[PDB]
Short mmCIF file of C-alpha atoms and ligand atoms in Angstrom, two decimals:
data_model
loop_
_atom_site.label_atom_id
_atom_site.label_comp_id
_atom_site.label_asym_id
_atom_site.label_seq_id
_atom_site.Cartn_x
_atom_site.Cartn_y
_atom_site.Cartn_z
CA UNK A 987 82.90 52.06 -76.84
CA UNK A 988 84.00 52.89 -80.53
CA UNK A 989 80.56 54.69 -81.93
CA UNK A 990 80.04 57.78 -82.84
CA UNK A 991 76.62 59.55 -82.59
CA UNK A 992 76.82 59.15 -86.41
CA UNK A 993 77.48 55.29 -86.80
CA UNK A 994 73.57 53.78 -86.37
CA UNK A 995 72.58 56.25 -88.96
CA UNK A 996 69.25 58.06 -90.38
CA UNK A 997 65.89 56.62 -91.10
CA UNK A 998 63.60 58.19 -93.32
CA UNK A 999 59.91 58.40 -93.10
CA UNK A 1000 57.18 58.68 -96.09
CA UNK A 1001 57.61 61.15 -98.05
CA UNK A 1002 61.21 61.06 -97.14
CA UNK A 1003 63.09 58.62 -98.79
CA UNK A 1004 66.76 57.47 -99.28
CA UNK A 1005 68.37 56.09 -102.14
CA UNK A 1006 72.37 55.59 -102.53
CA UNK A 1007 72.82 58.41 -99.91
CA UNK A 1008 70.70 60.66 -101.51
CA UNK A 1009 67.70 61.80 -99.57
CA UNK A 1010 64.64 62.75 -101.55
CA UNK A 1011 61.05 63.85 -101.05
CA UNK A 1012 58.64 62.16 -103.08
CA UNK A 1013 56.38 64.52 -104.46
CA UNK A 1014 52.63 63.50 -106.03
CA UNK A 1015 52.69 65.78 -109.17
CA UNK A 1016 48.77 66.27 -108.78
CA UNK A 1017 49.46 68.12 -105.63
CA UNK A 1018 53.09 69.22 -105.53
CA UNK A 1019 56.85 69.53 -107.39
CA UNK A 1020 60.23 71.40 -106.51
CA UNK A 1021 61.12 74.45 -108.38
CA UNK A 1022 64.36 74.76 -106.24
CA UNK A 1023 61.46 75.39 -103.49
CA UNK A 1024 58.42 73.02 -102.98
CA UNK A 1025 55.62 74.47 -104.96
CA UNK A 1026 52.37 73.45 -106.35
CA UNK A 1027 51.10 70.92 -108.88
CA UNK A 1028 53.03 70.28 -111.93
CA UNK A 1029 50.93 67.76 -113.52
CA UNK A 1030 49.14 68.79 -116.83
CA UNK A 1031 45.35 69.99 -116.39
CA UNK A 1032 42.52 68.32 -118.40
CA UNK A 1033 39.13 69.54 -119.83
CA UNK A 1034 37.53 65.92 -119.74
CA UNK A 1035 34.18 66.14 -121.78
CA UNK A 1036 31.53 62.98 -121.45
CA UNK A 1037 28.49 61.94 -121.23
CA UNK A 1038 27.31 60.92 -117.55
CA UNK A 1039 23.66 59.28 -117.38
CA UNK A 1040 22.42 60.31 -114.09
CA UNK A 1041 19.55 58.47 -111.94
CA UNK A 1042 16.50 59.59 -110.51
CA UNK A 1043 16.45 57.73 -106.83
CA UNK A 1044 14.00 59.61 -104.79
CA UNK A 1045 11.17 61.63 -106.04
CA UNK A 1046 12.09 60.33 -109.57
CA UNK A 1047 12.90 56.62 -111.48
CA UNK A 1048 13.85 58.36 -114.49
CA UNK A 1049 17.50 59.06 -115.86
CA UNK A 1050 18.85 61.94 -117.55
CA UNK A 1051 21.51 62.31 -119.93
CA UNK A 1052 24.19 64.88 -118.77
CA UNK A 1053 26.67 66.50 -121.06
CA UNK A 1054 29.66 67.09 -118.68
CA UNK A 1055 32.83 69.25 -118.90
CA UNK A 1056 35.27 68.28 -115.96
CA UNK A 1057 38.19 70.44 -115.23
CA UNK A 1058 40.78 69.04 -113.57
CA UNK A 1059 43.75 70.90 -112.20
CA UNK A 1060 45.75 69.78 -109.67
CA UNK A 1061 43.77 67.87 -106.99
CA UNK A 1062 40.72 70.11 -107.72
CA UNK A 1063 38.10 68.81 -110.12
CA UNK A 1064 35.32 70.93 -111.03
CA UNK A 1065 32.21 69.98 -112.97
CA UNK A 1066 29.93 71.94 -115.69
CA UNK A 1067 27.00 69.88 -116.46
CA UNK A 1068 23.74 70.54 -118.79
CA UNK A 1069 20.89 68.31 -119.03
CA UNK A 1070 19.75 67.08 -122.68
CA UNK A 1071 16.16 65.68 -122.46
CA UNK A 1072 13.35 65.83 -119.70
CA UNK A 1073 13.82 64.08 -116.22
CA UNK A 1074 10.21 63.07 -114.98
CA UNK A 1075 9.79 63.82 -111.44
CA UNK A 1076 7.15 63.12 -108.75
CA UNK A 1077 7.52 64.88 -105.58
CA UNK A 1078 8.75 68.12 -104.29
CA UNK A 1079 12.67 66.93 -103.95
CA UNK A 1080 14.56 64.74 -105.68
CA UNK A 1081 17.64 62.61 -105.62
CA UNK A 1082 20.04 62.32 -108.48
CA UNK A 1083 22.67 60.20 -108.55
CA UNK A 1084 26.13 60.33 -110.49
CA UNK A 1085 27.89 56.85 -110.25
CA UNK A 1086 30.97 56.73 -112.08
CA UNK A 1087 29.47 53.35 -114.07
CA UNK A 1088 27.21 55.39 -116.04
CA UNK A 1089 29.47 57.76 -117.38
CA UNK A 1090 30.14 57.04 -121.35
CA UNK A 1091 33.57 57.89 -122.67
CA UNK A 1092 35.13 56.72 -119.49
CA UNK A 1093 38.13 58.72 -119.08
CA UNK A 1094 41.28 57.18 -118.73
CA UNK A 1095 42.58 58.99 -115.44
CA UNK A 1096 39.44 57.94 -113.88
CA UNK A 1097 41.00 58.79 -110.56
CA UNK A 1098 40.21 62.62 -111.28
CA UNK A 1099 36.55 61.91 -110.82
CA UNK A 1100 36.93 60.36 -107.28
CA UNK A 1101 36.93 62.19 -104.01
CA UNK A 1102 39.38 61.97 -101.49
CA UNK A 1103 38.46 60.10 -98.21
CA UNK A 1104 38.73 63.64 -96.44
CA UNK A 1105 36.54 65.19 -99.02
CA UNK A 1106 34.16 62.33 -99.03
CA UNK A 1107 33.64 63.08 -95.36
CA UNK A 1108 31.02 65.51 -95.77
CA UNK A 1109 28.24 66.89 -97.96
CA UNK A 1110 29.60 69.41 -100.55
CA UNK A 1111 27.61 72.72 -102.56
CA UNK A 1112 25.96 71.87 -106.14
CA UNK A 1113 24.46 74.78 -108.11
CA UNK A 1114 21.61 73.39 -109.69
CA UNK A 1115 19.37 75.15 -111.98
CA UNK A 1116 16.48 73.86 -114.27
CA UNK A 1117 13.51 75.15 -115.91
CA UNK A 1118 9.82 73.77 -114.94
CA UNK A 1119 6.47 74.76 -117.18
CA UNK A 1120 8.54 77.78 -118.66
CA UNK A 1121 9.99 79.15 -115.10
CA UNK A 1122 13.68 79.03 -114.46
CA UNK A 1123 14.20 77.53 -110.82
CA UNK A 1124 17.91 77.74 -109.08
CA UNK A 1125 19.39 76.72 -105.84
CA UNK A 1126 22.63 76.27 -103.98
CA UNK A 1127 21.90 72.44 -103.26
CA UNK A 1128 24.23 69.83 -101.50
CA UNK A 1129 25.71 66.40 -102.81
CA UNK A 1130 27.16 63.62 -100.53
CA UNK A 1131 29.48 60.50 -101.88
CA UNK A 1132 27.88 57.34 -100.68
CA UNK A 1133 30.93 55.68 -101.92
CA UNK A 1134 34.24 56.41 -103.63
CA UNK A 1135 32.47 55.98 -107.21
CA UNK A 1136 28.82 57.90 -106.20
CA UNK A 1137 27.12 60.83 -104.94
CA UNK A 1138 23.92 61.76 -105.02
CA UNK A 1139 22.42 65.68 -105.26
CA UNK A 1140 19.21 66.44 -103.44
CA UNK A 1141 17.17 69.55 -104.80
CA UNK A 1142 13.93 71.13 -105.16
CA UNK A 1143 11.65 70.37 -108.28
CA UNK A 1144 9.99 73.44 -107.73
CA UNK A 1145 6.70 72.22 -107.16
CA UNK A 1146 4.45 68.98 -106.55
CA UNK A 1147 3.01 65.81 -108.38
CA UNK A 1148 4.34 64.70 -111.51
CA UNK A 1149 6.05 66.74 -113.64
CA UNK A 1150 9.27 67.28 -116.17
CA UNK A 1151 12.14 69.51 -115.38
CA UNK A 1152 14.38 70.52 -118.48
CA UNK A 1153 17.57 72.36 -118.89
CA UNK A 1154 19.09 71.05 -116.12
CA UNK A 1155 22.60 72.71 -114.81
CA UNK A 1156 24.77 71.26 -112.23
CA UNK A 1157 28.06 73.10 -111.22
CA UNK A 1158 30.13 71.72 -108.33
CA UNK A 1159 33.81 70.70 -107.72
CA UNK A 1160 35.34 67.93 -105.72
CA UNK A 1161 38.79 67.49 -104.16
CA UNK A 1162 40.50 64.27 -105.23
CA UNK F 1055 92.13 64.88 -85.73
CA UNK F 1056 89.75 61.96 -85.61
CA UNK F 1057 86.78 63.19 -86.59
CA UNK F 1058 84.69 62.31 -90.11
CA UNK F 1059 82.75 64.19 -92.16
CA UNK F 1060 79.77 62.29 -90.04
CA UNK F 1061 80.84 63.30 -86.48
CA UNK F 1062 79.30 66.78 -85.97
CA UNK F 1063 75.88 65.08 -87.30
CA UNK F 1064 72.95 66.54 -88.91
CA UNK F 1065 70.17 69.06 -87.39
CA UNK F 1066 66.73 69.45 -89.14
CA UNK F 1067 64.84 72.42 -89.48
CA UNK F 1068 60.98 72.47 -88.94
CA UNK F 1069 58.77 70.82 -90.65
CA UNK F 1070 61.56 68.02 -90.91
CA UNK F 1071 62.24 66.89 -87.32
CA UNK F 1072 64.39 63.96 -86.08
CA UNK F 1073 63.68 61.69 -83.31
CA UNK F 1074 65.48 58.31 -82.35
CA UNK F 1075 67.22 58.36 -85.73
CA UNK F 1076 64.21 58.78 -87.41
CA UNK F 1077 63.69 61.67 -90.01
CA UNK F 1078 60.00 62.83 -90.55
CA UNK F 1079 58.47 65.73 -92.32
CA UNK F 1080 55.37 67.41 -89.97
CA UNK F 1081 52.50 67.39 -92.06
CA UNK F 1082 49.36 69.67 -91.18
CA UNK F 1083 46.64 67.34 -91.80
CA UNK F 1084 44.43 70.15 -93.37
CA UNK F 1085 46.96 70.66 -96.37
CA UNK F 1086 48.85 67.68 -97.00
CA UNK F 1087 49.38 64.09 -96.12
CA UNK F 1088 51.37 61.11 -97.68
CA UNK F 1089 50.67 58.30 -99.68
CA UNK F 1090 53.79 57.35 -100.37
CA UNK F 1091 54.22 60.91 -101.77
CA UNK F 1092 53.50 64.02 -100.24
CA UNK F 1093 49.90 64.81 -101.06
CA UNK F 1094 46.80 66.93 -100.50
CA UNK F 1095 44.69 67.22 -97.35
CA UNK F 1096 43.86 64.02 -95.11
CA UNK F 1097 41.59 65.71 -92.59
CA UNK F 1098 37.91 65.42 -93.02
CA UNK F 1099 35.57 67.97 -94.83
CA UNK F 1100 32.62 69.48 -93.04
CA UNK F 1101 29.76 71.36 -93.62
CA UNK F 1102 28.84 73.97 -90.54
CA UNK F 1103 25.47 75.23 -90.40
CA UNK F 1104 24.68 77.94 -88.36
CA UNK F 1105 23.16 81.23 -87.59
CA UNK F 1106 25.01 84.39 -87.97
CA UNK F 1107 23.51 87.72 -86.80
CA UNK F 1108 25.62 89.99 -89.11
CA UNK F 1109 25.65 94.00 -88.05
CA UNK F 1110 25.08 96.92 -90.00
CA UNK F 1111 28.25 99.50 -89.43
CA UNK F 1112 27.63 102.07 -92.00
CA UNK F 1113 24.77 102.59 -94.06
CA UNK F 1114 22.89 100.65 -91.62
CA UNK F 1115 22.57 100.41 -87.75
CA UNK F 1116 20.38 97.50 -88.17
CA UNK F 1117 20.97 93.77 -87.51
CA UNK F 1118 20.24 90.89 -90.13
CA UNK F 1119 20.38 87.03 -89.25
CA UNK F 1120 22.20 84.92 -91.89
CA UNK F 1121 21.26 81.21 -92.41
CA UNK F 1122 24.97 80.02 -92.97
CA UNK F 1123 26.64 76.82 -94.59
CA UNK F 1124 30.49 76.84 -94.46
CA UNK F 1125 31.90 74.23 -96.44
CA UNK F 1126 35.29 73.26 -94.73
CA UNK F 1127 37.60 71.46 -96.76
CA UNK F 1128 41.25 71.58 -96.43
CA UNK F 1129 42.31 74.63 -95.50
CA UNK F 1130 39.62 76.26 -97.87
CA UNK F 1131 35.99 77.10 -96.07
CA UNK F 1132 33.52 78.11 -98.17
CA UNK F 1133 30.55 80.18 -97.19
CA UNK F 1134 26.82 80.35 -98.56
CA UNK F 1135 24.76 82.47 -96.84
CA UNK F 1136 21.26 83.35 -96.90
CA UNK F 1137 19.28 86.28 -94.97
CA UNK F 1138 15.68 85.76 -92.75
CA UNK F 1139 14.08 89.03 -92.57
CA UNK F 1140 14.43 92.48 -93.64
CA UNK F 1141 17.77 94.50 -93.35
CA UNK F 1142 17.16 98.50 -92.65
CA UNK F 1143 19.79 100.45 -95.18
CA UNK F 1144 19.70 104.54 -94.84
CA UNK F 1145 22.24 105.04 -97.65
CA UNK F 1146 23.09 103.53 -101.44
CA UNK F 1147 26.25 101.44 -99.71
CA UNK F 1148 25.95 99.48 -96.83
CA UNK F 1149 28.90 97.80 -94.70
CA UNK F 1150 27.82 94.20 -93.12
CA UNK F 1151 30.15 93.03 -90.26
CA UNK F 1152 30.48 89.37 -89.70
CA UNK F 1153 32.01 88.98 -86.04
CA UNK F 1154 32.67 85.14 -85.10
CA UNK F 1155 31.10 86.29 -81.53
CA UNK F 1156 27.38 86.86 -83.51
CA UNK F 1157 27.45 83.18 -84.49
CA UNK F 1158 25.28 81.03 -82.80
CA UNK F 1159 25.75 77.26 -82.62
CA UNK F 1160 29.62 78.12 -82.71
CA UNK F 1161 31.32 75.20 -84.25
CA UNK F 1162 34.11 73.13 -82.31
CA UNK F 1163 36.61 73.91 -85.23
CA UNK F 1164 36.13 77.38 -84.92
CA UNK F 1165 39.78 77.30 -86.60
CA UNK F 1166 38.08 76.75 -90.16
CA UNK F 1167 36.38 80.32 -89.73
CA UNK F 1168 39.63 81.97 -89.43
CA UNK F 1169 41.34 83.30 -92.36
CA UNK F 1170 45.42 82.74 -92.72
CA UNK F 1171 47.34 86.16 -91.88
CA UNK F 1172 48.01 85.71 -96.12
CA UNK F 1173 44.46 85.68 -97.27
CA UNK F 1174 43.42 88.73 -94.61
CA UNK F 1175 46.23 90.68 -96.46
CA UNK F 1176 43.89 91.69 -99.14
CA UNK F 1177 40.14 92.44 -99.98
CA UNK F 1178 38.45 89.32 -101.31
CA UNK F 1179 35.22 88.94 -103.70
CA UNK F 1180 32.03 88.44 -102.65
CA UNK F 1181 28.84 87.77 -104.34
CA UNK F 1182 25.99 89.63 -102.87
CA UNK F 1183 22.11 89.82 -104.31
CA UNK F 1184 18.80 90.67 -102.57
CA UNK F 1185 15.55 92.38 -103.47
CA UNK F 1186 14.38 95.62 -102.82
CA UNK F 1187 11.14 96.86 -103.78
CA UNK F 1188 10.28 93.64 -105.54
CA UNK F 1189 13.53 93.85 -107.90
CA UNK F 1190 17.00 91.80 -107.38
CA UNK F 1191 20.17 93.58 -107.39
CA UNK F 1192 23.05 91.19 -107.66
CA UNK F 1193 26.80 92.54 -107.64
CA UNK F 1194 30.62 91.11 -107.11
CA UNK F 1195 31.08 92.98 -103.71
CA UNK F 1196 34.29 92.49 -101.66
CA UNK F 1197 35.25 91.72 -98.09
CA UNK F 1198 38.34 92.76 -96.05
CA UNK F 1199 39.03 91.05 -92.72
CA UNK F 1200 39.74 94.05 -90.00
CA UNK F 1201 41.10 91.25 -87.46
CA UNK F 1202 41.27 87.63 -87.59
CA UNK F 1203 37.43 87.49 -86.42
CA UNK F 1204 36.16 90.06 -88.34
CA UNK F 1205 34.91 91.08 -91.88
CA UNK F 1206 33.30 93.52 -93.76
CA UNK F 1207 31.35 93.34 -96.86
CA UNK F 1208 30.23 96.47 -98.56
CA UNK F 1209 27.67 96.54 -101.28
CA UNK F 1210 25.30 99.15 -103.15
CA UNK F 1211 21.97 98.88 -101.58
CA UNK F 1212 19.95 99.56 -105.23
CA UNK F 1213 18.67 102.94 -104.24
CA UNK F 1214 18.91 105.80 -101.90
CA UNK F 1215 17.46 106.84 -98.51
CA UNK F 1216 15.47 104.56 -95.99
CA UNK F 1217 14.60 101.36 -97.05
CA UNK F 1218 14.06 97.57 -96.44
CA UNK F 1219 16.12 94.73 -98.23
CA UNK F 1220 15.51 91.28 -97.84
CA UNK F 1221 16.59 87.67 -99.34
CA UNK F 1222 20.12 88.70 -98.72
CA UNK F 1223 22.34 86.29 -100.12
CA UNK F 1224 26.12 85.89 -99.52
CA UNK F 1225 28.72 83.96 -101.23
CA UNK F 1226 32.36 84.02 -100.65
CA UNK F 1227 35.08 81.75 -99.17
CA UNK F 1228 38.45 82.11 -97.34
CA UNK F 1229 41.74 80.16 -97.19
CA UNK F 1230 42.48 79.47 -93.53
CA UNK T 1023 88.54 48.91 -93.92
CA UNK T 1024 87.94 51.82 -91.63
CA UNK T 1025 84.92 53.50 -92.93
CA UNK T 1026 81.70 53.05 -91.16
CA UNK T 1027 77.94 53.28 -92.70
CA UNK T 1028 78.21 57.37 -92.07
CA UNK T 1029 81.52 57.99 -93.82
CA UNK T 1030 80.24 58.44 -97.20
CA UNK T 1031 77.64 61.12 -96.04
CA UNK T 1032 73.95 62.04 -97.20
CA UNK T 1033 73.21 64.19 -100.23
CA UNK T 1034 69.99 66.04 -100.28
CA UNK T 1035 68.12 66.41 -103.10
CA UNK T 1036 65.67 69.69 -104.00
CA UNK T 1037 63.60 71.18 -101.99
CA UNK T 1038 65.72 69.37 -99.69
CA UNK T 1039 68.92 71.18 -99.15
CA UNK T 1040 71.50 71.22 -96.22
CA UNK T 1041 73.65 73.98 -95.03
CA UNK T 1042 76.33 73.65 -92.05
CA UNK T 1043 74.82 70.81 -91.16
CA UNK T 1044 71.40 72.00 -91.08
CA UNK T 1045 68.95 70.37 -93.22
CA UNK T 1046 66.02 72.43 -94.60
CA UNK T 1047 62.63 72.16 -96.74
CA UNK T 1048 62.75 75.31 -98.82
CA UNK T 1049 59.28 76.06 -99.25
CA UNK T 1050 57.86 78.55 -102.13
CA UNK T 1051 55.72 81.00 -99.69
CA UNK T 1052 53.07 81.29 -102.27
CA UNK T 1053 52.18 77.48 -101.72
CA UNK T 1054 53.11 76.48 -98.31
CA UNK T 1055 54.81 77.48 -95.15
CA UNK T 1056 55.64 75.74 -91.57
CA UNK T 1057 54.31 76.50 -88.74
CA UNK T 1058 55.82 73.08 -86.89
CA UNK T 1059 54.22 71.20 -89.45
CA UNK T 1060 54.16 71.65 -93.37
CA UNK T 1061 50.89 74.07 -94.20
CA UNK T 1062 49.46 76.10 -96.68
CA UNK T 1063 50.86 79.60 -98.19
CA UNK T 1064 51.89 82.49 -96.09
CA UNK T 1065 52.82 85.28 -98.31
CA UNK T 1066 50.27 88.20 -98.60
CA UNK T 1067 47.05 87.59 -100.72
CA UNK T 1068 46.44 90.78 -103.18
CA UNK T 1069 43.51 92.30 -104.98
CA UNK T 1070 45.28 94.04 -108.09
CA UNK T 1071 43.23 96.39 -110.16
CA UNK T 1072 43.99 97.03 -113.50
CA UNK T 1073 42.21 97.72 -116.94
CA UNK T 1074 42.82 95.23 -119.76
CA UNK T 1075 42.13 95.89 -123.28
CA UNK T 1076 41.01 92.56 -124.79
CA UNK T 1077 41.22 92.01 -128.61
CA UNK T 1078 38.94 90.46 -130.93
CA UNK T 1079 40.70 87.62 -132.86
CA UNK T 1080 38.00 85.78 -134.78
CA UNK T 1081 34.07 86.86 -135.14
CA UNK T 1082 35.80 90.43 -134.27
CA UNK T 1083 38.34 92.91 -134.84
CA UNK T 1084 37.48 95.15 -132.08
CA UNK T 1085 38.65 95.70 -128.86
CA UNK T 1086 37.16 96.19 -125.35
CA UNK T 1087 38.35 97.93 -122.57
CA UNK T 1088 38.01 95.44 -119.27
CA UNK T 1089 38.24 96.75 -115.59
CA UNK T 1090 39.72 93.89 -113.92
CA UNK T 1091 40.13 92.68 -110.13
CA UNK T 1092 42.51 89.93 -109.93
CA UNK T 1093 42.47 88.33 -106.35
CA UNK T 1094 45.37 86.66 -105.78
CA UNK T 1095 45.77 84.28 -102.84
CA UNK T 1096 48.39 81.20 -102.80
CA UNK T 1097 49.08 80.51 -106.65
CA UNK T 1098 45.38 81.25 -107.18
CA UNK T 1099 44.60 84.12 -109.42
CA UNK T 1100 40.78 84.48 -109.61
CA UNK T 1101 39.79 87.57 -112.20
CA UNK T 1102 36.41 89.31 -112.15
CA UNK T 1103 35.95 91.42 -115.33
CA UNK T 1104 33.44 94.14 -116.13
CA UNK T 1105 33.55 95.81 -119.68
CA UNK T 1106 33.37 99.83 -120.80
CA UNK T 1107 31.84 100.51 -123.82
CA UNK T 1108 30.38 98.07 -126.96
CA UNK T 1109 32.28 95.33 -128.63
CA UNK T 1110 31.31 94.99 -132.02
CA UNK T 1111 31.06 91.58 -133.35
CA UNK T 1112 30.61 90.27 -136.81
CA UNK T 1113 29.58 86.62 -136.15
CA UNK T 1114 27.86 83.88 -133.79
CA UNK T 1115 31.07 83.13 -132.22
CA UNK T 1116 33.68 85.69 -131.01
CA UNK T 1117 37.12 84.63 -129.60
CA UNK T 1118 38.58 87.49 -127.53
CA UNK T 1119 42.29 87.56 -126.42
CA UNK T 1120 43.60 88.46 -123.06
CA UNK T 1121 47.59 89.28 -123.70
CA UNK T 1122 49.39 90.94 -120.43
CA UNK T 1123 51.03 93.42 -123.00
CA UNK T 1124 47.75 95.00 -122.99
CA UNK T 1125 47.06 95.90 -119.32
CA UNK T 1126 47.53 98.92 -118.21
CA UNK T 1127 48.76 99.75 -114.46
CA UNK T 1128 51.01 96.49 -115.12
CA UNK T 1129 51.34 94.88 -111.41
CA UNK T 1130 54.57 94.58 -110.42
CA UNK T 1131 53.92 90.85 -109.35
CA UNK T 1132 53.16 89.75 -112.91
CA UNK T 1133 53.75 86.61 -112.26
CA UNK T 1134 50.42 86.21 -110.45
CA UNK T 1135 49.02 86.71 -113.76
CA UNK T 1136 50.56 84.07 -115.35
CA UNK T 1137 49.54 80.47 -115.35
CA UNK T 1138 51.53 77.00 -114.22
CA UNK T 1139 53.04 74.88 -117.49
CA UNK T 1140 50.33 72.20 -115.79
CA UNK T 1141 47.12 74.67 -115.90
CA UNK T 1142 48.55 75.79 -119.39
CA UNK T 1143 48.05 72.35 -120.65
CA UNK T 1144 44.32 72.47 -120.86
CA UNK T 1145 41.03 74.52 -121.62
CA UNK T 1146 39.49 76.69 -118.61
CA UNK T 1147 36.20 77.52 -117.68
CA UNK T 1148 35.12 80.92 -118.17
CA UNK T 1149 31.98 82.32 -116.94
CA UNK T 1150 30.73 85.21 -119.87
CA UNK T 1151 27.45 87.15 -119.93
CA UNK T 1152 26.76 90.25 -122.03
CA UNK T 1153 23.64 92.49 -123.37
CA UNK T 1154 22.66 92.32 -126.89
CA UNK T 1155 19.61 94.16 -128.03
CA UNK T 1156 18.29 94.74 -124.30
CA UNK T 1157 18.55 90.98 -123.89
CA UNK T 1158 21.46 89.21 -121.69
CA UNK T 1159 23.29 86.37 -122.79
CA UNK T 1160 25.08 83.95 -120.19
CA UNK T 1161 27.63 81.22 -121.08
CA UNK T 1162 29.65 78.94 -119.49
CA UNK T 1163 32.70 79.60 -121.66
CA UNK T 1164 36.38 78.07 -121.91
CA UNK T 1165 39.16 79.67 -122.37
CA UNK T 1166 43.12 78.59 -123.33
CA UNK T 1167 46.55 79.83 -123.20
CA UNK T 1168 48.19 80.11 -126.56
CA UNK T 1169 51.32 81.11 -124.65
CA UNK T 1170 52.18 81.79 -121.13
CA UNK T 1171 51.15 85.45 -121.55
CA UNK T 1172 48.03 85.06 -123.45
CA UNK T 1173 44.99 83.31 -123.39
CA UNK T 1174 41.89 83.17 -125.88
CA UNK T 1175 38.30 82.57 -124.59
CA UNK T 1176 35.65 81.53 -126.96
CA UNK T 1177 31.76 82.15 -126.62
CA UNK T 1178 28.53 82.82 -128.71
CA UNK T 1179 27.62 86.03 -129.50
CA UNK T 1180 23.71 85.53 -128.93
CA UNK T 1181 23.17 86.23 -132.87
CA UNK T 1182 24.27 86.46 -136.34
CA UNK T 1183 25.84 89.65 -138.49
CA UNK T 1184 27.16 92.71 -137.06
CA UNK T 1185 26.25 93.80 -133.94
CA UNK T 1186 27.56 95.99 -130.74
CA UNK T 1187 27.47 93.63 -127.35
CA UNK T 1188 27.65 95.69 -124.12
CA UNK T 1189 28.09 95.07 -120.23
CA UNK T 1190 30.56 92.12 -120.73
CA UNK T 1191 31.69 90.26 -117.73
CA UNK T 1192 34.20 87.79 -117.65
CA UNK T 1193 35.01 85.54 -114.33
CA UNK T 1194 37.64 82.87 -114.14
CA UNK T 1195 40.64 81.79 -112.33
CA UNK T 1196 44.10 80.12 -112.89
CA UNK T 1197 46.41 78.50 -110.97
CA UNK T 1198 50.29 80.16 -111.17
ZN1 LIG M 2791 75.73 50.21 -81.86
ZN1 LIG M 2792 84.25 68.11 -83.47
ZN1 LIG M 2793 85.14 55.39 -98.72
#
């Protein structure tokens, strides 16, 4: 009966789509694009600069202002942070929390400061250094997202008891 | 004769595939995914921790235990390694070999510690530092895969003759 | 009238293409490939080594030879550069320009030293360090492409007036 193998037609599953008999690959421009062939991102990179007030959440109840540059290039966002002021610590380890609500400025493309579900699944490396009693301490530390808006880094304070650390730098990156 | 331009039908070459008249893009979830549009990886990142006994293969016949964190995020795996113990070196340059067979633990997703054929094609940068006679030496070094399971890094030892280096750190990453 | 929903046929928009009833995804091998599913790059990585004469363009009218290793892996190119000689600086900030025309050698795949339009859109982080009067200065600096062949980095010189800096290292990367 009268049909050909073509009669029933083809359906196209995302990221493939058809419109008006024209079949396309839908491309997130932060990840990929076409220049005849499928290649890497076309979206413009940006370098965001803002202040992030980080909060001590264990081994500190203090806060510390961080000057942040976030270099967003494709779906990678790299953070370079430097403190102003001292952070008061109370123990040999401190947890420092970075919640998007504590950024001033607040970039328009806030999506670039939010990790992917995949990336959120694990602890991630963070380079930390700071000065305490005129010595530099520097550590390969780790951060972890507790939710899509909030990560916390854990690092040693270079001593015990109450002390004030300064010149805290934080370097890390996330996949968004 | 009786056919239309549709009669002979369309064939779909990988990573495109058809099943039941539904055309799909097959996506490696470590590389890409769809959220309407084609975007970056959906697979969960992981932070693997294990001990890697590295072997001196020139300028040393010794071995050294490395504490390794491997942060696997998409098809990128970044290594952060720190030694325990001393490595005995005999020359001004040492070659230190990292073979998957010498990892204890042995993560289930061992595929994350294997570089792609493309990445294997070239030497890759490795940051190395260690202490020798109370001085720190630190170098931009290079590694190269001799096979898919084995890479070797080459770095200066900071002197000559027989000596023992300690606090060896290795930072590098691979594309898998 | 006589047509079916198949009569008019399907058109395929780049990076999808049809030839001889076979529908393909065209893949830039520096970005992606297929191993049944769509995955990451298949092109061979390379480690290019060349000399780059950088030019002082503000706070210096001098030039400085840089020994460059460019690790090209997919569409990421990472630069590791170390100077030979001194650079004469005249101010507390220097601008150092890296134009492809000043590379000797001149790799065949010069496309790997050219950033994407997207990446070019923003300033990018550059790690800089150098020695001046027997002290090391080290900074998170920034570079910016003024055109597809030319970027300039800006960094502090660690003092004022006329001076000569040495052991300048530059580490950064670009998306191509
Ligand atoms: Zn039917
Ligand atoms: Zn026929
Ligand atoms: Zn018609």
